[PDB]
Amino acid sequence: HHHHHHMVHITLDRNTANSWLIISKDRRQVRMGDTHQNVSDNKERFSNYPMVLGAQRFSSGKMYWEVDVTQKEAWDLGVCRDSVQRKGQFSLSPENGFWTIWLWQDSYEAGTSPQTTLHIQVPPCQIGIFVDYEAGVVSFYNITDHGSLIYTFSECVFAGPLRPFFNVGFNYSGGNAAPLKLCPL
Ligand SMILES: CN1CCO[C@@H](CNc2nccs2)C1
């Protein structure tokens, strides 16, 4: 792929984070803490899952960024509508305003409804995410495997401004503590 020149500098929005997340000073890394992080509650915070949004909002154009997922067992990545539900239980689907992929239990899947099996021969350490707002496309690339395509959502009905979306996953196993990191341009 030749999407690298649409690179955008993404930072995480603390106010949207689940109350157990720890975001670095530079707002470029996030990990699951072992307890509540001593923040006040607000209507933006994801309550049920270890999720956070990027600060940036996109309503046009082409955007690209990269995320490091090294040594994680579970995570979700992609984009979502600014108006997604924050409280209670929900599934990651385009009907609910999410365009995502994930790792869970040693398999990769796209967040369609129902979910779609991904075919990845080289487990990725860094994921590239490309959004073409006008075309209605969200694509995912395997940076570890020379940029190979993982998945394309096409005919997307965004229906609002988009935000970068992250889930660091739970750490019930003790093997999923590692952070998500936004990689330098
Ligand atoms: C009372 N419910 C409502 C909120 O989510 C449920 C568990 N989820 C999380 N706990 C830690 C961080 S995310 C507990």
Curated annotation (Swiss-Prot):
<feature type="domain" description="B30.2/SPRY">
    <location>
        <begin position="8"/>
        <end position="185"/>
    </location>
</feature>
<comment type="subunit">
    <text>Homotrimer. Component of a SCF(SKP2)-like complex containing CUL1, SKP1, TRIM21 and SKP2. Interacts with CALR, CUL1, FBXW11, HSPA5, IKBKB, IRF3, SKP1 and VCP. Interacts with SKP2; the interaction with SKP2 does not depend on an intact F-box domain. Interacts (via N-terminus and C-terminus) with DCP2 (via N-terminus and C-terminus). Interacts (via C-terminus) with IRF8 (via C-terminus). Interacts with ULK1, BECN1 and with ATG8 family members, including GABARAP, GABARAPL1, GABARAPL2 and MAP1LC3C/LC3C. Interacts with TRIM21 and SQSTM1/sequestosome 1. Interacts with IRF3.</text>
</comment>
<comment type="function">
    <text>E3 ubiquitin-protein ligase whose activity is dependent on E2 enzymes, UBE2D1, UBE2D2, UBE2E1 and UBE2E2. Forms a ubiquitin ligase complex in cooperation with the E2 UBE2D2 that is used not only for the ubiquitination of USP4 and IKBKB but also for its self-ubiquitination. Component of cullin-RING-based SCF (SKP1-CUL1-F-box protein) E3 ubiquitin-protein ligase complexes such as SCF(SKP2)-like complexes. A TRIM21-containing SCF(SKP2)-like complex is shown to mediate ubiquitination of CDKN1B ('Thr-187' phosphorylated-form), thereby promoting its degradation by the proteasome.</text>
</comment>
<protein>
    <recommendedName>
        <fullName>E3 ubiquitin-protein ligase TRIM21</fullName>
    </recommendedName>
</protein>
<comment type="similarity">
    <text>Belongs to the TRIM/RBCC family.</text>
</comment>
